[PDB]
Design a protein around this nucleic acid. Structure first.
Lengths: 50, 215, 100, 136
RNA sequence: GCAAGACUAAAACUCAAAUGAAUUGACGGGGGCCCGCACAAGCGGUGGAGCAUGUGGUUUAAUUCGAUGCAACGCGAAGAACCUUACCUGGCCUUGACAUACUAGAAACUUUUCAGAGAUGGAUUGGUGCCUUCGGGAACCUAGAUACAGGUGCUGCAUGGCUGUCGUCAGCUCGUGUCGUGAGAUGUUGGGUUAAGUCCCGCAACGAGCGCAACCCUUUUCCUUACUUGCCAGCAUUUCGGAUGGGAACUUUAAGGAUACUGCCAGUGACAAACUGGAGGAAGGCGGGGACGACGUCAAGUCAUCAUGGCCCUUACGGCCAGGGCUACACACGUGCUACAAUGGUCGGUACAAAGGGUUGCUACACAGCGAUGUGAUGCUAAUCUCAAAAAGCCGAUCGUAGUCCGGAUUGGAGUCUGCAACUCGACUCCAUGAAGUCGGAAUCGCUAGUAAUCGCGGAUCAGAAUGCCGCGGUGAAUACGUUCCCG
């Protein structure tokens, strides 16, 4: 934290990454097109695998 | 002693982040550097438009910049030319298409940044600092805050020895994590050097926690 | 840092980027078992004859805002002073004070 | 402390003999958390004394402890009972350390048997405390 | 007047004060009360040896600069072979490596060489592009001109911002009403109690804010939702490996909740605040840890992160390059690591973790090598593959108190890897060598429970380079009578 010399003066920061997994089984035809119609919210990244 | 940053200590408690996007560890640094460049450029360009907050989002391969301003007409322009020019420059800087959005502040006297900017402008225009401080504090208290503290530091009045003077009316519970406290810092550049201005404004205690705040 | 040092860093980055391909080609040729010992030897001589600034080991990470050469934190690309200031302002997504 | 009275920390009985005295002796012997080595040392000596006289290990140990127990410190004043036992164990481990034999367990058993007849450096130090108490 | 001296008693000259009483602070080698690993009681250290690291000094062409009692000295530096680099030697450039403003010409770019230590300089190829109201424009480069750029040069005693410290100390204030000519006082004192100006009583006082506490994170018990890449109680098949059908029970993963509040009983204190003992409960009186640091002090630290007033340089105090130095060595000091052995050393067999990292990366397996490693090859963008062997531990054999089958410094000889390049000056492997060291004076340091002690594992910085720093788990103690003295 200090600009020149204080070794014991530190700030401790952290960052967390959260993950979720979702499975879709027996997908109807409307399911897929609904999934691309679904909006994307900032701050959440989505990966879809077929 | 030294005090923790009022917004930093509450960034995860009752406050929202100014940047809302996700990036993998490889792209995090590039995204952050471009965001900082965007913030600096906007701050330089909109100096006289009363802009306090800038929120940057990256929803999907694009960018959205929300500007909180008290001069929406000046920011927008006569016929919308300014906003489209701003979109062009932001897209050029950021490498992706960018959308500018405007959020109008209806109570400028309850915004910490605007008060500090006004006080610094007066100090540069060499009004006496105690009059400036008392006027700003009274104006905010009339506007309806539950407390405001104003501090100025430096070569006040041109004296050879610097000093610090502060003024407070109302309640400022700095140690309450759930209190809503806006904080701002600014510089006045006078012929005799730099004068620092700090402003705290208290607007009541938020209840329900971050669940209520809806992160 | 100084403008001269920042420009030096920029020039070294440009040289490395310019010479990236041939260096990899020569290194692969040197590693090639099927290639002749002579092929590997002249490959090594050409590699040694390449300019010094083409070597990535001469690049030093500097803060993207001030150019400071100490305390880099690869993840953010900023030195410790600017990282502290910007995190405490709240412009870094996800970073909060840590307690456990 | 200054204002509070801190309670003594109760130690669990030894899982093999249910003897807090044996557990305390093991804790006195143990160094840097190596409980297994101290357990082996103490149990080996307890088995050795049992073979060399067929007596109960617990009773033989309490009797020797009471023999090597002092009565006074140093200004004369009456030592509280816990410190008596704590000081006796320290003497019994220190003096046992200085004998010459293959293992610590054998040294401990040997000097336990020696002290049972009043012959040992711990009892000599006890007589030294008696003399310097007569001095005061 | 014997004497020592007494009595009467000026002026020149010089200053703008000298004094009395009372008020608020501060201080006292003044007095009471109180707290804190402050002492006392304990367990381990330092001061002694070898090595690592920082500082002073000395030396040097240079050994770049800053930090100096506690609160500088494994500090800035989360990582100096070139680079970094700010220092030295020598070689080069001058509107400049970089900006704006003006004037002209060119696409920009690209190939091959030559001289040179390199910076640079000279020849040598291809290409000559994008819009266009298309008379030119967009980048980009080259040439000229001057306003200027540039400066880790000076001032932290001109400043902003940021930080240390007293100290996680418990205090710091304001408005009406009373007393005093007044500055001021009262409230905020007095009696108990507490980790706390925490709470309760009396009291010319009656009322409020910032501080304390709580709101935030993590750990301990249970419930709901969720069932894969994680799990396997019951069934079935098994090459005996959750391996395979299968199951949603359990562990776990991670979001939301519930619970603890002197709630119940007994005794005390005032009869209050409280305090002591007991049941139930995973947990009992603040359950454990973290973050959060009031009014203020030190002309405390930083112009070398950055910004900034003023001062200074402009063929140089600016810019480019190669080599050297920051790693020196008669010495002194601080912080550490490894030992002096049997509660141990070596050899063989065999168990039990947590957290974290991995696509310019981590690598199963096979072959080669004594080994550091090399080659082929496989999986992994990861609860899926991998780093990875946990170590101390247990069982068996041997060594028998010896400078040793302890210790592992130093030196000789062979190598591997990173890198354009390990001479100055890298890490690691093998053979040989086998130093001091026998538990360390005066003095001095840390720690009150999953703590001290001891054992291993991971990460940031990073091509390579931790005994430092920041984290993770395993095993797991001793002692607290008390405030008489030491410190705050």
């Amino acid at each position: 934290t200090s600009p020149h010399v204080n070794k014991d003066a530190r700030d401790q920061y952290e960052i967390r990454t959260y993950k979720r997994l979702i499975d879709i089984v027996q997908p109807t035809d409307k399911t897929v097109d609904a999934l691309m119609k679904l909006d994307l919210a900032a701050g959440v990244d989505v990966q879809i695998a077929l | 002693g030294q005090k923790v940053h009022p917004i930093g200590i509450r960034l995860g408690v009752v406050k929202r982040h100014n940047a809302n996007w996700y990036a993998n560890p490889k792209q995090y640094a590039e995204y952050l550097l471009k965001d900082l460049q965007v913030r600096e450029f906007l701050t330089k360009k909109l100096k006289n438009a009363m802009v306090s907050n800038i929120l940057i989002e990256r929803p999907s391969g694009a960018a959205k910049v929300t500007i909180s301003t008290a001069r929406p007409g000046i920011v927008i322009g006569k016929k919308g030319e300014d906003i489209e020019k701003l979109q062009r420059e932001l897209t050029n800087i950021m490498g992706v298409p960018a959308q500018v959005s405007i959020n109008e502040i209806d109570r400028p006297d309850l915004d910490a940044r605007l008060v500090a900017e006004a006080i610094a402008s007066q100090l540069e225009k060499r009004v006496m600092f105690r009059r400036a401080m008392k006027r700003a504090v009274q104006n905010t208290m009339r506007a309806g805050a539950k407390g405001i503290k104003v501090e100025v530091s430096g070569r006040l009045g041109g004296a050879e020895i610097a000093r610090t003077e502060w003024y407070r009316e109302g309640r400022v519970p700095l140690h309450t994590l759930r209190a809503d406290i806006d904080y701002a810092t600014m510089r006045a550049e006078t012929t005799y050097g730099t004068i620092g201005v700090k402003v705290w404004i208290f607007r009541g205690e938020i209840l329900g926690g971050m669940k209520q705040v809806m992160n | 840092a100084k403008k001269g040092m920042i420009n030096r860093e920029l020039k070294r980055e440009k040289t490395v980027a310019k010479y990236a391909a041939k260096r990899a080609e020569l290194k692969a040729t040197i590693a090639n078992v099927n290639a002749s010992d002579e092929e590997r030897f002249e490959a090594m001589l050409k590699l040694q004859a390449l300019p010094r600034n083409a070597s990535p080991v001469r690049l030093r990470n500097r803060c993207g805002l001030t150019g400071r050469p100490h305390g880099y934190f690869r993840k953010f690309g900023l030195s410790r002073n600017k990282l502290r200031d910007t995190v405490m302002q709240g412009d870094v997504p996800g970073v909060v004070k840590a307690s456990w | 402390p200054r204002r509070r009275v801190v309670a003594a920390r109760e130690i669990l009985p030894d899982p093999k003999f249910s003897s807090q005295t044996i557990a305390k002796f093991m804790n006195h012997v143990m160094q840097d958390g190596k409980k297994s080595i101290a357990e082996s040392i103490v149990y080996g000596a307890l088995e050795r004394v049992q073979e060399k006289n067929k007596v109960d290990p617990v009773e033989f140990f309490e009797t020797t402890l009471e023999k090597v127990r002092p009565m006074v410190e140093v200004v004369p004043m009456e030592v509280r009972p816990s410190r008596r036992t704590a000081l006796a164990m320290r003497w019994l481990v220190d003096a046992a350390a200085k004998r010459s034999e293959k293992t610590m367990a054998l040294r401990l058993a040997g000097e336990l048997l020696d002290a049972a007849e009043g012959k040992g450096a711990a009892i000599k130090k006890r007589e030294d405390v008696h003399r310097m108490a007569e001095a005061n």
